[PDB]
Amino acid sequence: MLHEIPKSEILKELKRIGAKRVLIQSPEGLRREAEELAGFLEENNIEVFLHGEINYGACDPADREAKLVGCDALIHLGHSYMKLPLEVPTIFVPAFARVSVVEALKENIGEIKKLGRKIIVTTTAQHIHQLKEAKEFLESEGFEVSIGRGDSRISWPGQVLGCNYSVAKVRGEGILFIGSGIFHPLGLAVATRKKVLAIDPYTKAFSWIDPERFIRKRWAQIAKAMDAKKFGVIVSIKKGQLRLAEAKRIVKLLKKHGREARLIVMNDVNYHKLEGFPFEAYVVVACPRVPLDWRKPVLTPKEVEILLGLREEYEFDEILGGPRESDEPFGISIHST
Amino acid sequence: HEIPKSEILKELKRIGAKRVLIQSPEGLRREAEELAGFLEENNIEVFLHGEINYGACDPADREAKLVGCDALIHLGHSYMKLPLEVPTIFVPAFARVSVVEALKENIGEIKKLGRKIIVTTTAQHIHQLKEAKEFLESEGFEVSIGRGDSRISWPGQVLGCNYSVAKVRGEGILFIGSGIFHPLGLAVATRKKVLAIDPYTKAFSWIDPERFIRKRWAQIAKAMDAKKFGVIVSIKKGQLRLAEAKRIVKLLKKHGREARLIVMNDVNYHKLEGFPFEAYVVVACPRVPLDDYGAWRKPVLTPKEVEILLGLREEYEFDEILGGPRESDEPFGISIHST
Ligand SMILES: C[S@@+](CC[C@H](N)C(=O)[O-])C[C@H]1O[C@@H](n2cnc3c(N)ncnc32)[C@H](O)[C@@H]1O
Ligand SMILES: C[S@@+](CC[C@H](N)C(=O)[O-])C[C@H]1O[C@@H](n2cnc3c(N)ncnc32)[C@H](O)[C@@H]1O
Numbered sequence: 001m002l003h004e005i006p007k008s009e010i011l012k013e014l015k016r017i018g019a020k021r022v023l024i025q026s027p028e029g030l031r032r033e034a035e036e037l038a039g040f041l042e043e044n045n046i047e048v049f050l051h052g053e054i055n056y057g058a059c060d061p062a063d064r065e066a067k068l069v070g071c072d073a074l075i076h077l078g079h080s081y082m083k084l085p086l087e088v089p090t091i092f093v094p095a096f097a098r099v100s101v102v103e104a105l106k107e108n109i110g111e112i113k114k115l116g117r118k119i120i121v122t123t124t125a126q127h128i129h130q131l132k133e134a135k136e137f138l139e140s141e142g143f144e145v146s147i148g149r150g151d152s153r154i155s156w157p158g159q160v161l162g163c164n165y166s167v168a169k170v171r172g173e174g175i176l177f178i179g180s181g182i183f184h185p186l187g188l189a190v191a192t193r194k195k196v197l198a199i200d201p202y203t204k205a206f207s208w209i210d211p212e213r214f215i216r217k218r219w220a221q222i223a224k225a226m227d228a229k230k231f232g233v234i235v236s237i238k239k240g241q242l243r244l245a246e247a248k249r250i251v252k253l254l255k256k257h258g259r260e261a262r263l264i265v266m267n268d269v270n271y272h273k274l275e276g277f278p279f280e281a282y283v284v285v286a287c288p289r290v291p292l293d294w295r296k297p298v299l300t301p302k303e304v305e306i307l308l309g310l311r312e313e314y315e316f317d318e319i320l321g322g323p324r325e326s327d328e329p330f331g332i333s334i335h336s337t
Numbered sequence: 338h339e340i341p342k343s344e345i346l347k348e349l350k351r352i353g354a355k356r357v358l359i360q361s362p363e364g365l366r367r368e369a370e371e372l373a374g375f376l377e378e379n380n381i382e383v384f385l386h387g388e389i390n391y392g393a394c395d396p397a398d399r400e401a402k403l404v405g406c407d408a409l410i411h412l413g414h415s416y417m418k419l420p421l422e423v424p425t426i427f428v429p430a431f432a433r434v435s436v437v438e439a440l441k442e443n444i445g446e447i448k449k450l451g452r453k454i455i456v457t458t459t460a461q462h463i464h465q466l467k468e469a470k471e472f473l474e475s476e477g478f479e480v481s482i483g484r485g486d487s488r489i490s491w492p493g494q495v496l497g498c499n500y501s502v503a504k505v506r507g508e509g510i511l512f513i514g515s516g517i518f519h520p521l522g523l524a525v526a527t528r529k530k531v532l533a534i535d536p537y538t539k540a541f542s543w544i545d546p547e548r549f550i551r552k553r554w555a556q557i558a559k560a561m562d563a564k565k566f567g568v569i570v571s572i573k574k575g576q577l578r579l580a581e582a583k584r585i586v587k588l589l590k591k592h593g594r595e596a597r598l599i600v601m602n603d604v605n606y607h608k609l610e611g612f613p614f615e616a617y618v619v620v621a622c623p624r625v626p627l628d629d630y631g632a633w634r635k636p637v638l639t640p641k642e643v644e645i646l647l648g649l650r651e652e653y654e655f656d657e658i659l660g661g662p663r664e665s666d667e668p669f670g671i672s673i674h675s676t
């Protein structure tokens with residue numbers, strides 16, 4: 001369960017810009033909420049279109065789509081703004097989980113002490129509004145809590161994304177991750193080379209990350225691709241995911257190492273669409289969680305650098321930004337370019 | 338019958354193209370890359386469009402503009418009238434099969450259509466239409482071939498959304514080609530006797546639209562209970578039906594029901610699964626709700642079937658996407674268009 005959508009404040013903002021037609025995108029967990037909000041915005045004399053795509057991140061604003069169907073503004077549900085040009089005014093509506101992370105921490109004090117005294121703390125957007133609490137709880141348990149600001153991909157200090165761990169590139173003895181799943185903790189472990197403890201707030205269960213099984217798993221993908229002469233190098237037109245330059249360099253780099261390479265342009269990168277092409281292996285230069293989560297081997301940019309013998313240590317593929325001057329609000333935000 | 342790589346290279350070389358994007362449908366994925374390597378051998382940077390293209394109603398010109406491509410190559414289909422943001426070379430696919438042989442085999446069934454007949458085929462046999470015409474006249478028929486509107490590329494060519502080439506004077510309609518969908522489309526859109534002849538198998542079928550129209554009445558009945566409706570547009574350039582979509586939303590509301598306009602690119606159920614809507618209306622390619630093998634677990638309707646459900650239409654009508662008048666005809670070969 002989440003905190004309820006702030007329907008009133010969104011309309012107050014929409015009324016401020018006198019928007020008449022709005023497109024609302026939403027991720028898989030907020031489909032019922034999207035229509036729920038559309039009914040409320042229509043009840044206040046505003047036309048609403050729902051974006052039928054399943055959204056995966058603020059890296060994919062549907063602003064262009066909003067323009068093509070003549071919407072004044074864009075409502076983006078469930079994610080916080082990351083730095084992007086926006087062709088229409090966009091209201092970002094972050095989702096905040098109500099679960100108590102301090103309760104989850106108090107259950108696992110013993111495990112956290114194993115990380116060290118000075119510890120780096122990280123969480124995902126659903127728990128970011130409780131990061132102040134967790135810091136205060138940990139400091140009251142003798143910890144020095146180090147939280148990184150992160151870069152322009154990131155909306156709040158201490159926030160991680162599947163594609164970015166800049167908040168964890170600060171001084172510290174170990175990393176605590178507050179959230180569900182193992183991809184973020186795995187990525188933190190690989191990216192920082194530090195011990196990572198992952199605590200799931202919904203179950204209070206904990207997890208000591210060991211990336212070796214994941215890295216071995218990836219190396220078989222690399223080894224399987226070692227015999228391939230025909231590579232496809234994939235970009236995504238999603239605005240915060242397009243990495244044309246880097247993809248071109250991978251193409252150039254493969255050709256310069258006796259391989260054939262073709263740049264491939266997609267929106268949603270999914271293998272099922274590629275099965276007819278003649279390529280023997282693939283490199284995704286987009287959302288890193290796509291190859292890291294296909295009947296032919298699919299590699300990240302870093303991994304193809306390893307395959308070519310230009311890099312030795314394994315590296316998570318991250319999309320970085322530059323410096324971020326200010327922090328997104330713990331609430332709805334509105335941006336335009 | 339070939340991908341004329343040389344004619345394509347020369348078109349590109351003329352217009353100063355240096356970076357090109359190539360679309361392909363499912364059956365020409367390998368040819369797309371062979372062409373790409375050819376053009377690259379000739380100092381032209383080439384990207385492939387990783388999407389699977391389902392027709393010329395879906396040009397990748399905006400995508401090409403996004404990645405700095407100064408031209409688009411669209412393999413496997415012919416031009417339909419659409420604005421395009423980059424020069425685009427259409428490379429239609431043409432089947433080799435001689436069709437006259439299948440006509441002669443079945444000349445007795447063809448005569449059952451009447452003296453004056455309407456002759457139609459798909460794009461991959463459109464070059465055979467001149468031969469089929471001369472033959473059928475030489476056997477005594479009078480051969481009427483409709484020109485079609487601006488979504489059609491050549492006279493006598495039918496598309497899954499468009500049977501305008503068949504809306505001409507004539508007793509019955511002959512269709513030359515394989516498969517069921519197109520003949521069935523002709524029968525419903527013209528309510529005329531339709532004879533289909535497969536040029537590969539020399540097999541014939543007299544199309545009865547009975548079972549099809551019954552299955553569609555079945556769908557409409559499943560929606561009579563529905564209170565909440567999703568009305569879908571696809572932003573594919575040649576499919577976007579925004580005004581016709583808004584009209585259905587206004588109509589559904591004007592008849593008690595709730596209705597919401599849903600914007601998508603590729604239309605399929607899985608993406609809408611989380612929504613609360615009890616039934617869907619697709620205002621786009623009509624072959625999405627009509628040619629559904631059962632991926633849609635909720636009732637999905639065409640605009641015309643909606644008017645039947647709200648009680649505004651008596652007889653079933655095929656949902657077509659109609660263009661304006663076509664002043665010229667596309668070549669039998671590659672075409673190049675910029676707008
Ligand atoms: C669901 S989002 C995760 C939420 C949040 N953005 C985060 O940082 O963790 C990531 C998932 O979306 C899917 N995804 C992201 N970009 C994609 C793309 N361009 N094509 C296909 N799938 C994509 C991948 O399956 C990936 O595992
Ligand atoms: C090969 S395409 C049609 C080719 C050609 N234009 C014609 O008229 O026959 C046929 C299939 O494409 C699919 N299709 C068309 N538009 C689509 C869309 N916007 N989203 C998902 N599927 C689509 C439909 O399911 C349909 O059965």
Ligand code: SF4
Nearest residue numbers: 056057059162163287
């Ligand atoms: S790039 Fe991938 S992980 Fe990063 S925000 Fe977008 S979908 Fe999420």
Ligand code: SF4
Nearest residue numbers: 391392394497498622
């Ligand atoms: S039938 Fe559907 S896929 Fe074929 S041309 Fe018409 S809209 Fe495009």
